[model samples]
Target: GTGAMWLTKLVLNPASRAARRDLANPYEMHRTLSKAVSRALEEGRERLLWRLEPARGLEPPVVLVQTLTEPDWSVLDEGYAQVFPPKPFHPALKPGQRLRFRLRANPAKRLAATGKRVALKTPAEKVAWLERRLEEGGFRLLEGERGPWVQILQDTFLEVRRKKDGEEAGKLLQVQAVLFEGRLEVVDPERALATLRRGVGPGKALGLGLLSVAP
Candidate 1:
């Protein structure tokens, strides 16, 4: 059997201006996450599969994290409080089964001619990018081969900075995010399960490739 999924939520203090600023920079936010749950993780070769998100609505800000396993977040420091308990997630998957899913992915392609990678800029290209991902993940859109099986509701770019000691702090890298939602069929169960566990695309470190699904 596959392992459990874990959801972690932390509400930041409204009084802390730095807390809100920290979430905007990927470099800072990942450091915060590392501090928040670093010790709870298992010592293994497989990387951590997780997503970081800002809470919805017009209310005060909050940070939500989803991971493939439980982590020791009880050690969270001041200016942060656990608003929710760690919850287990399980997916019921089988070959030829269909399910509705949503995934926030970093979509890009490398031009063979130039040998340079580029982010998919247009909505059409973004949709095509995910279609290729689905094919490789052992799933297909219910729509025909000419399809846009998923609806891209939000497409945005995020800036990330490499961790450097001093001079390189100002340098930045951009990550493109495609939030996709739609129904898909599992063509191969093992492959589909593998995809669900290992994730679908790049920028996993910056919280881009966690696939969430429902019946």
Candidate 2:
């Protein structure tokens, strides 16, 4: 039998009142998506966590979610999570029925433009090549909350590296495509050279995340 099919590409839906009623329910996408994640975690065992926020502008009606598990290096194709508004509480959600809605949220610090801007210090030719490279590599740049944009590229081999340390050590490569641009500001009371602010402050996308996003 088929594994699962996720929903996608929707706007008000324009279907029926029942469908509209379904959308009226207010639940955090992360919450419902969490269920899928929970399932993946149960399958993978204490390893899965929701890595992305739903506010990141994922498609509505349903978002396909996947979890990676690899004994070798092809874990990226293992599991994925497909999330929707979620099935109703009582009465339960029947098959052939789905919930959908348009989530309106103005994320904080969201940059007006993403990838590379013409006004940037970098030349357009280089920017074009970078964007092209990401596309070719099965990755896409995503605008993060506010100016902290994250380049989200889906990788298929998450499990392989986690398991086979020796094998992964030689083959492991950063598959997630994320880049930040910004600068550093060292308070030079002595009037010394400027500080290297995080991000390519000199007009790049290496925003704040590069500096200490993990801390």
Candidate 3:
């Protein structure tokens, strides 16, 4: 039998104290959402994936979460957010299928000298980084009139800090995040499904690497 997958939508009420706090901290956001799927996580059946959708005109903050198992949202604090009923997601992927895709990822590479990662600086470099990742992940970017159909929608940093004993501590983490949107062809269905489930790149714990696709 095929494994289960689910997609859930959450709309945060900014007026709620807890919602406001999670909005400011990605770590807190992850921790808060994890509670809904804690059982699956403990059982090693969940690959939690979530992304904060781009803001729309004066609308409440929206988040999309995907998992490999069912989730229970009743554990969340009341009034913290509005949860739409989770939907079953099972894409029928096939080789050569074309799809529009969006991914929020950290485009970085390790330094040859120090073995530490650094964000790709130029637009060309960033685009190249994404192309390489997609190629390895069983997808190929479809070219448009200008070149590749892909475009970087946003480039920003997410500032995160480690929490210890319920107190924020340790060095502040500055993660380079980039939003990519474009069309791609599935080069290999099995690998593509694996990529979709495992996500891409790092910074997953801080809300990066969830690749979304549509027909």
lDDT of each: 0.70, 0.25, 0.87
**TM, every model:** 0.80, 0.20, 0.93
**Candidate 3: RMSD over Cα atoms?**
1.9
Per-residue alpha-carbon lDDT of model 3 for 69-100, expressed as tens digits?
88899988989889999999887678888999
The collision pairs in model 1 are: none
Clashes of each: 0, 34, 0
| TM-score result, candidate 3 | 0.93
Better of 1 and 2 by TM-score: 1
Model 2 weakest 10-residue run by lDDT: 206-215
* lDDT (Cα, tens digit) per residue for candidate 2, span 41-114: 46744221112213335443432222222111122112222213322112122222222211111112223666
Give the winner by lDDT: 1 or 3: 3
Residue 170 miss distance in model 1 (angstroms):
4.5
lDDT of 1 by residue, 12-31 (tens): 66566556655566566666
Arrange candidates by TM-score, descending.
Answer: 3, 1, 2
Model 3 residue 139 CA deviation (Å) reads 1.2
